[PDB]
Design a protein around this ligand. Structure first.
Ligand SMILES: [Cl-]
Ligand SMILES: [Cl-]
Ligand SMILES: [Cl-]
Ligand SMILES: [Cl-]
Ligand SMILES: [Cl-]
Ligand SMILES: [Cl-]
Lengths: 170, 170, 170, 170, 170, 170, 170, 170, 170, 170, 170, 171
């Protein structure tokens, strides 16, 4: 069994090595893709020290979404941004990660990771309900609060859960 | 009378020269524009051996969508990707092609071309329904299953129809 | 009290300096961000002659939307393209401007600027309704008609109102 | 009946839109050239939304000064920098705008635009009188003092007059 | 049994995919290489959707002509330009495609494709005669007259024949 | 009538403006193309001060040889290098200049310009003879001796004759 | 008080750290700017080991001449080239250095540094004479002879005086 | 004896080979420099085929004006643009050609080449008069009228005279 | 006496340091040129540790073929490719190596180096006889069959002879 | 109380955020530098989400080692490579990181992190002892064996310890 | 059994092909890595004609030293620079080559190649002694005098022995 | 007709090198210059060529030969000499042209140390200076001084390169 991790434009993408690692215990291949806006949060060579394949549509523009989707029994968005959730809910797919996801709702799990204002946005909530309606699994993200070093303020968030929790959810 | 062909990111865009040839039998100008993602499937210099105008937003970023729309009696999306359909259904126009289409629903004909999984995605079907409600012509593309050389598998697709059927539909 | 001006890809963005000047009569900081397609319409150094901060994610990709959002009491979109309205109505936030506006519906005022046909597009009109229902404040622009030098034709538009009208509305 | 606007390196170049629009009510073509130093204050693609030709030395280095001069009945420098005035007074033509003007004193109208200390420089003052002695019309611009937002101080300048005053003068 | 398609700098190169698909019904591998000049008429990633190997001298300058020749039972030049026909006749092999052909005359078939004036150049005639004498098989290309969209004129040509005839000739 | 000047890689290419001026006395249009090696000897913008059209394959790789040949009543090579002469005689056409010349022997004049050693090379003479047989007109160039500044030696050459002799030859 | 050192295109610019050091004994800030030509004679990160601000027009093209000028009690040109002296005498300000100086004659001291032939050029002497009449302070430069390594010859110059003479003169 | 030819931004600069050859009959070294704006009119490598040294300030920025002037018994400006005439007369030297000329009035011969309007400009005439006063020789340029291919209009010019005429003047 | 070694695109070019060392015992200068295609097989700086001049067309595109030919008493092509032998045989000189050889058949010695299939091409065999008829000496190279490491198979070639045999033949 | 974390060319440099976070509890500023070879393992914008300052010699080559050392009460190397350990011990300091540590032995702690063959290289052990004798504090890292995804093999290492252990040791 | 050859910055590196070929008589794979300064002495694609893998840090920065070391039974440095020897003795490993050797002293054999003066340097001799005590095998090279063409002088060196000698020693 | 080569390292005192060149020209026929890799950013090679005879630039000519350069010079000096360069030399590390030149020519080599006192007093640096002396390299008995540093606005202690006349007397 193979899993594809879809990484979005969040700081929490920098922890993905710890999820590659736990997932390699129970899946044969753990592969990773990033959104265009996600590529700047990550180091492609570093992911390749853990995951089996890094799809990079900038290096290989002609990678096929159907073939990638078919190779995987599970596809997760972790961390999932508001933008990616709301694109997927409306069938928007102007990059490879979004297109893969659009081909495979039945294999798809989303791990919401965002600021509370974005999570509680009416459009986001409705779109999360469309997706649940359409067969996509959404992790029941807890609302946490925490000191953010970059701003020197407390921020309220829903965040990607711990790795072992991902393994149970999928 | 003038027609505009809008090419999306699909391998079926490399057959566009055949449709241009046949549309020149009915139309004064056959002009062409590609989506950003569709640019990599085609060769704009080859396109200009057959079309009258190739609109290229990268070469000329101040191209005007209203002026382009107004100059055409018919605008077609061939091949029409899932992405482009779902974007057009939601009013998203973040490239020139999409902006042109937004301006001219009453002139707009779409030829879906995509994997069956994407065609059957509930969101895409919802969006197809909406486009029809807003008066966009949608070609009744047939579902075919052929052997794909690129993956060495059989795939099920809705596909752009032969050129003479495009002529009859618009 | 601080105000953020979000400009979209419209020729009316070249008049933003007058809006900045007039807005500085009433707010401490007048700041500015452009859409990605917006950038080509404005001159960033010229904007910095009048505004206090010009937020540029191509220059600084890790600018944080929530910190910029919280910094401001009012966020206006002017001129507001159909694209940006339709993305925001759908929760789509794939550049920084969009991500800011997504986080702050309750502070948002939109000044539509687009051709009649885009304005009358039923999706645009549905989404404008939707935004108002979710607490976004939308200027009641009227269709005007003027001679457009670029096309040597009369064009019908909704346009950004004069600065005094902006001050009044927000 | 043709007019050329020559723009120099002043922030008042950003309002050339309004002058072009006004001049278009009285002249067949309204064309534009910028000095090398003025290019950075404007956006050529925006300029071309309003003027008939934007002459760009860097795009087309072999543009001819006599042919361009001959094409126009009236050539104006608005806003005219102290540099460009003093170069023209001394016959210095190391760019296309200055070379055009050197060829066309009989057709030339100058609208000074500068800080008062530059306007009051005896060298500038001497060059103005020379330019008048040799048949160049210099707008009798008056000193004005306003708050400059960029420096947060009041500044005295002589400024280009509003559009209608330009039509009245030339 | 493997075949190598050598494509030259002709617009008829854009139809190469139909010949590839046809040749895949008989041959195990169908591989492709283009002349230096032919590269601009084609898209290598699109070719790789249908062919097994696309040999690219620019990307892999050390590709070995002898190993490539030896891997293939048949080598065809389609479309064959006058230039390539004439360089092969004369032992000129200054690119990878021509070098390969030079090492494998006994495996070589040529499908002339060129304006009649070039086909009836006496030098080209003489060189077709000399290539047959060396046991290179030259398709007996028929002359045809057609309307050419790119010139808005009728051109006389010898043309690559339909794919089924290609299969039948080799 | 129109004439095309093909310039090859020789320092006599720097005098071509005197040929254009003389040819303009007798030809509606005098156009110019250079060999790839000939480009480094000339200045394109300087040529376009004198000639009507300068065809530049690097700027426009899809210039059509047929369409260019057909526009011209007489095509000349002046100065014609040994390399170009020998290539035309063998039907090699790996640039645009040789391709055009390959399609119009009927209309082709050649003005040898080269050192004596190259002129008296037997392969050149054989090729000169073959071109004469197949309809091309070779100017009976004569052998001169001249002090050459670049080497500080007397060299023996065959050269392009004076401009008026070019007019009387064609 | 603040002083601004303006350096021109001269090898004596390499000694400016010693003048900066000297001036820091009297002035609060010693800031530095180079002419465009001057820039190749110096190293701006090395200048910044000594001065407070290094104004760099190529890095920050919108630096304001009036605000820089106003910040400084004294502005000195050291070493002042014949070019800069003559441009200043004529009101030519085509770079930031010359513009600043143009706005601040009353604050300006010049330290002529140049070959004797350039000093005794009558135009330079005329311009020195006019600069004095306009109230610009000119160091009474003395004429030294010395062996110059670069040419291996004896050269006569007027040169910048020692640091202590500079402090004393301003 | 050694002579330096200074070329300016004029199309007449493309015959300088003819002047170089002539001047070699009576001068041991014939060297050449272009103004920055004259570089686009000439080919430096073609120049080095005839001249002894081509002084290229872009490739060697530290070429020394005093040393270059000292090497030459005569410096000639041919063709001399109005800009370069007017800059010499005002002691401006922001390129190497201007600087070398500022250092050696007593060795300087100027051959004016320009449109009549520039020649009859009162500022240009002032400056010609001043240079004669200061010992520069100015060739008695005649006014000629001729048809200019580039514009397709008769132009009035003062022009650099025949080569032998230059030799008897310097 | 001086000797020039012309290197072509063969892996045996890597051995040329041995040949230069050998030849330096008999000839004053031993100089080297590469074919355009051969440059990728060699290291110009390494060549320069051994040969006196390395002629590089790309670094020095105006290197003169006559001057270089004349400097040398013997010119050899080692290793000589089928391409270069066939071009020279037909007077084709589209690079500097081939142009030098074209000038000096009477000085020229060729050491073939190519796969047997190429050597046994009737075209090559023909061109070899022609070259001998024109007085070019062709080493009587033996056919040899070696294990080739790069392909893991045995190959039949004709091969450049050992250095000492090159001294004996030349 | 500031602490500087120095980062070396190790895969454990990807866990550094976790150390930054823990250290910001006990220290006011936690700052970061990487070795030249550490840079490719790290994301400098991501680091700036957690650290106060990131010293980047490539962006700011003139950062002063003495000033950076003086600013910090503790400097730690973590992860510390063999290379960096062995350079520091011999006083080699050809990057900013090593020069900072060369200036500050009395503040320096080292957390070695490398394969066991490197740790047990006798030169590394000797160097570790010298550093101990020179006041540097070496974390007594334990040997651990573990499965490395990157190789698919078990590896023995000394590794950087958990963040809390780092706090306890410095 | 596999062997790794580590090439350093020496002109004797251009003979490494003979070493690889002879080593392929006894080892399954013969692989190769160059030092950073050695890269400029060799031609990578040429090396891949003979070796099985050429390890290139610049093309693949994440290549792993432990994995490469473990793969090989013998690692040889040849030619071995003074620098590399002295770096290895000290534990310095700031490129991939050095890092490999650092990890595998027990498999390492060094073939010194340097000037007498570097070889006789006391540090170099202490370092050779140190490496022997640490298990490294050092070829007991002899000083030989050779005439060096590069300098036209006789030089004294220790050099890499012939391939058969390498086979014997390792 | 002796020749001296000045080796410049990565320190702000390299900015003064035209003065030393001017003065060495009274004692030496050619005065030539090379910089370390990091040293290059402190200087302006074309400015150096106004004063020196040859500026050896490894970036512009990567095949310059350290043996031929060393043999052309009677005296080789490192001025200013960084701690890194001294410690690389002590250990035979020659990863650039300057360092390779010094490795080949210890018997000709004089070092004028220039660095913060902390680096001078680092025992590693002190051990290497002693070894360099053991192997016959001349080390200028550098002056320890405390001066106000504009760049940091603080007082720093340094060993510093000496005035040009002291260089002339030491070599
Ligand atoms: Cl101003
Ligand atoms: Cl054709
Ligand atoms: Cl001077
Ligand atoms: Cl071969
Ligand atoms: Cl050596
Ligand atoms: Cl220091």
């Amino acid at each position: 069994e193979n899993v594809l991790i879809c990484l979005c434009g969040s700081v929490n993408s920098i922890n993905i090595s710890h999820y590659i690692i736990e997932l390699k215990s129970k899946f044969d291949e753990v592969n990773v893709i990033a959104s265009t806006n996600g590529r700047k949060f990550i180091n492609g060579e570093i992911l390749k020290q853990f995951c089996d394949n890094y799809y990079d549509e900038f290096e290989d523009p002609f990678l096929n979404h159907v073939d990638i989707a078919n190779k995987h029994d599970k596809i997760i968005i972790l961390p999932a941004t508001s933008n990616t959730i709301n694109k997927i809910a409306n069938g928007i797919c102007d990059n490879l990660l979004l297109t893969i996801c659009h081909t495979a709702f039945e294999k798809l799990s989303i791990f919401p990771n965002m600021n509370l204002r974005m999570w509680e946005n009416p459009v986001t909530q409705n779109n999360i309900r469309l997706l649940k309606d359409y067969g996509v699994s959404i992790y029941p993200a807890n609302i946490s609060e925490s000191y953010e070093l970059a701003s020197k303020t407390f921020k309220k968030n829903v965040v990607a859960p711990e790795p072992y929790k991902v393994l149970e959810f999928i």
